[PDB]
Design a protein around this motif. Structure first.
Motif, PDB file in Angstrom:
ATOM      1  N   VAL A 155     -21.748 -15.611 117.150  1.00  9.28           N
ATOM      2  CA  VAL A 155     -23.138 -14.533 116.151  1.00  9.28           C
ATOM      3  C   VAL A 155     -23.377 -12.999 116.891  1.00  9.28           C
ATOM      4  O   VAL A 155     -23.265 -11.881 115.988  1.00  9.28           O
ATOM      5  CB  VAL A 155     -24.121 -15.042 115.725  1.00  9.28           C
ATOM      6  N   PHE A 212     -33.107  -8.717 127.871  1.00  5.64           N
ATOM      7  CA  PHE A 212     -31.517  -8.714 127.270  1.00  5.64           C
ATOM      8  C   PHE A 212     -32.194  -7.932 126.284  1.00  5.64           C
ATOM      9  O   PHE A 212     -33.002  -8.332 125.718  1.00  5.64           O
ATOM     10  CB  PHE A 212     -31.759  -9.720 126.898  1.00  5.64           C
ATOM     11  N   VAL A 257     -37.609  -5.091 113.179  1.00  3.03           N
ATOM     12  CA  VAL A 257     -36.207  -5.192 111.415  1.00  3.03           C
ATOM     13  C   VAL A 257     -35.283  -3.804 111.593  1.00  3.03           C
ATOM     14  O   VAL A 257     -34.130  -3.898 110.890  1.00  3.03           O
ATOM     15  CB  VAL A 257     -36.698  -5.704 110.279  1.00  3.03           C
ATOM     16  N   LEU A 294     -35.358 -17.412 126.873  1.00  2.00           N
ATOM     17  CA  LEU A 294     -35.493 -16.693 126.898  1.00  2.00           C
ATOM     18  C   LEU A 294     -36.402 -16.601 125.179  1.00  2.00           C
ATOM     19  O   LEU A 294     -36.222 -16.505 124.401  1.00  2.00           O
ATOM     20  CB  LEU A 294     -34.383 -15.468 126.420  1.00  2.00           C
ATOM     21  N   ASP A 324     -33.545  -2.565 113.587  1.00  2.00           N
ATOM     22  CA  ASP A 324     -32.535  -3.802 114.066  1.00  2.00           C
ATOM     23  C   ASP A 324     -32.564  -4.045 115.183  1.00  2.00           C
ATOM     24  O   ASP A 324     -30.921  -3.818 115.488  1.00  2.00           O
ATOM     25  CB  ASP A 324     -30.452  -3.740 112.798  1.00  2.00           C
ATOM     26  N   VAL A 343     -28.667 -10.532 114.756  1.00  2.00           N
ATOM     27  CA  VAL A 343     -28.070 -11.259 115.816  1.00  2.00           C
ATOM     28  C   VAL A 343     -28.710 -12.674 115.428  1.00  2.00           C
ATOM     29  O   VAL A 343     -28.663 -13.960 115.125  1.00  2.00           O
ATOM     30  CB  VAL A 343     -27.312 -10.511 116.938  1.00  2.00           C
ATOM     31  N   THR A 344     -30.027 -12.560 115.936  1.00  2.00           N
ATOM     32  CA  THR A 344     -30.904 -13.669 116.570  1.00  2.00           C
ATOM     33  C   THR A 344     -31.735 -13.945 114.768  1.00  2.00           C
ATOM     34  O   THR A 344     -32.470 -15.084 115.505  1.00  2.00           O
ATOM     35  CB  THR A 344     -31.556 -13.761 118.003  1.00  2.00           C
ATOM     36  N   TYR A 366     -23.400  -9.892 127.523  1.00  2.00           N
ATOM     37  CA  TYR A 366     -23.070 -11.678 127.076  1.00  2.00           C
ATOM     38  C   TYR A 366     -22.779 -12.061 125.583  1.00  2.00           C
ATOM     39  O   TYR A 366     -23.320 -11.106 124.814  1.00  2.00           O
ATOM     40  CB  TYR A 366     -24.582 -11.880 127.340  1.00  2.00           C
ATOM     41  N   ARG A 367     -22.688 -12.913 125.569  1.00  2.00           N
ATOM     42  CA  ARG A 367     -21.628 -13.216 124.177  1.00  2.00           C
ATOM     43  C   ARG A 367     -22.941 -14.168 123.736  1.00  2.00           C
ATOM     44  O   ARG A 367     -23.343 -14.537 124.303  1.00  2.00           O
ATOM     45  CB  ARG A 367     -20.772 -14.380 124.210  1.00  2.00           C
ATOM     46  N   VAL A 368     -23.223 -13.615 122.805  1.00  2.00           N
ATOM     47  CA  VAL A 368     -24.483 -14.770 121.746  1.00  2.00           C
ATOM     48  C   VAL A 368     -24.099 -15.637 120.999  1.00  2.00           C
ATOM     49  O   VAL A 368     -23.087 -15.228 120.455  1.00  2.00           O
ATOM     50  CB  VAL A 368     -25.482 -13.463 120.811  1.00  2.00           C
ATOM     51  N   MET A 369     -24.019 -17.280 121.599  1.00  2.00           N
ATOM     52  CA  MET A 369     -23.121 -17.865 120.439  1.00  2.00           C
ATOM     53  C   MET A 369     -24.856 -19.971 120.167  1.00  2.00           C
ATOM     54  O   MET A 369     -25.548 -19.315 120.272  1.00  2.00           O
ATOM     55  CB  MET A 369     -22.947 -19.338 121.539  1.00  2.00           C
ATOM     56  N   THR A 370     -23.978 -19.550 119.109  1.00  2.00           N
ATOM     57  CA  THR A 370     -24.493 -20.588 118.271  1.00  2.00           C
ATOM     58  C   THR A 370     -23.371 -22.555 117.911  1.00  2.00           C
ATOM     59  O   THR A 370     -22.643 -22.458 117.714  1.00  2.00           O
ATOM     60  CB  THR A 370     -25.028 -20.550 116.603  1.00  2.00           C
ATOM     61  N   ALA A 410     -35.795 -17.624 119.722  1.00  2.00           N
ATOM     62  CA  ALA A 410     -35.650 -17.392 121.147  1.00  2.00           C
ATOM     63  C   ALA A 410     -33.779 -17.885 121.304  1.00  2.00           C
ATOM     64  O   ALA A 410     -33.575 -18.884 120.629  1.00  2.00           O
ATOM     65  CB  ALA A 410     -36.535 -18.505 121.872  1.00  2.00           C
ATOM     66  N   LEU A 411     -33.776 -18.970 122.343  1.00  2.00           N
ATOM     67  CA  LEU A 411     -32.715 -17.872 123.032  1.00  2.00           C
ATOM     68  C   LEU A 411     -32.507 -19.047 124.768  1.00  2.00           C
ATOM     69  O   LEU A 411     -33.387 -19.225 125.117  1.00  2.00           O
ATOM     70  CB  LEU A 411     -32.088 -16.838 123.517  1.00  2.00           C
ATOM     71  N   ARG A 412     -31.718 -19.156 124.620  1.00  2.00           N
ATOM     72  CA  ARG A 412     -31.204 -20.187 126.317  1.00  2.00           C
ATOM     73  C   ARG A 412     -29.921 -20.053 127.358  1.00  2.00           C
ATOM     74  O   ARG A 412     -28.899 -18.822 127.213  1.00  2.00           O
ATOM     75  CB  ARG A 412     -30.415 -22.091 125.711  1.00  2.00           C
TER      76      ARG A 412
END
Ligand code: A1BXN
Lengths: 39, 156
Positions: free
Chosen positions: B21, B31, B57, B50, B60, B37-38, B8-12, B42-44
């Motif tokens: 991103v 996931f 950290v 999610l 990573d 990256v995040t 999946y792509r992670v987008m903003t 939280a993510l949609r």
């Protein structure tokens, strides 16, 4: 708000492009998760 | 939201247009991506949400909806594939034999492939299509080129 979009299956693809070398590198990893070249 | 396995792509939208991103892997309803990256946000997934479940950290790494599921390892001999997913461009397998990060705590697989930072979180696979770790944390070398660790988490 970040969001996700699906981009493909997870599959090994026979006859993929074959590139890049194979370096042996001396690295350190700090508390912040950043790698660095030990020299 | 979408909980089918795969990448999946992670987008903003927080910047100009829709910006990629990073990337991640859905498996067993979890996931998996990289922390940088995040930042543990939280993510949609359409209407679905999610929430972060596990994070570190230093490794990573970060999982959403459940514990880290990916427990396959580079065998130290065979070639691998970076299922690279760059911003604006289609998913693309890129086959390579990993080098080595030598550290005081142990030796780690490394892949010498250069792609934009938005590609961080793309999975690396063994010959059976199992994810042996994620691309996007490593080092810039004498040349100016980028070398990434094969970063893998522990399954409980
Ligand atoms: N080419 C690159 C340069 N700087 C940082 C990066 C982080 C992840 C992946 C690739 C990178």
């Amino acid at each position: 708000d970040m969001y996700i979009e699906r981009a493909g299956d997870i599959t090994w693809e026979k006859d993929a492009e074959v590139t890049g070398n194979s370096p042996r590198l001396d690295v350190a990893l700090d508390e912040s998760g950043d790698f660095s070249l030990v020299e | 939201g979408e909980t089918t396995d795969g990448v999946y792509r992670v987008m903003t939208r927080r910047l100009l247009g829709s910006t990629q991103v990073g990337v991640g892997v859905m498996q067993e309803g979890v996931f998996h991506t990289m922390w940088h990256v995040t930042k543990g946000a939280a993510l949609r997934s359409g209407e679905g949400r999610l929430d972060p479940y596990w994070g570190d950290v230093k490794q990573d790494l970060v999982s959403y909806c459940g514990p880290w599921k990916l427990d396959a390892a580079w065998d130290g001999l065979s070639e691998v594939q970076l299922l690279a997913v760059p911003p604006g461009e289609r998913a693309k397998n890129i086959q390579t034999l990993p080098g080595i990060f030598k550290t005081k705590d142990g030796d780690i697989g490394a892949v010498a492939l250069d792609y934009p930072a938005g590609t961080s979180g793309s999975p690396i696979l063994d010959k059976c299509g199992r994810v042996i770790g994620l691309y996007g944390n490593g080092v810039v070398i004498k040349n100016g080129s980028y070398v990434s660790a094969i970063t893998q988490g522990k399954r409980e």
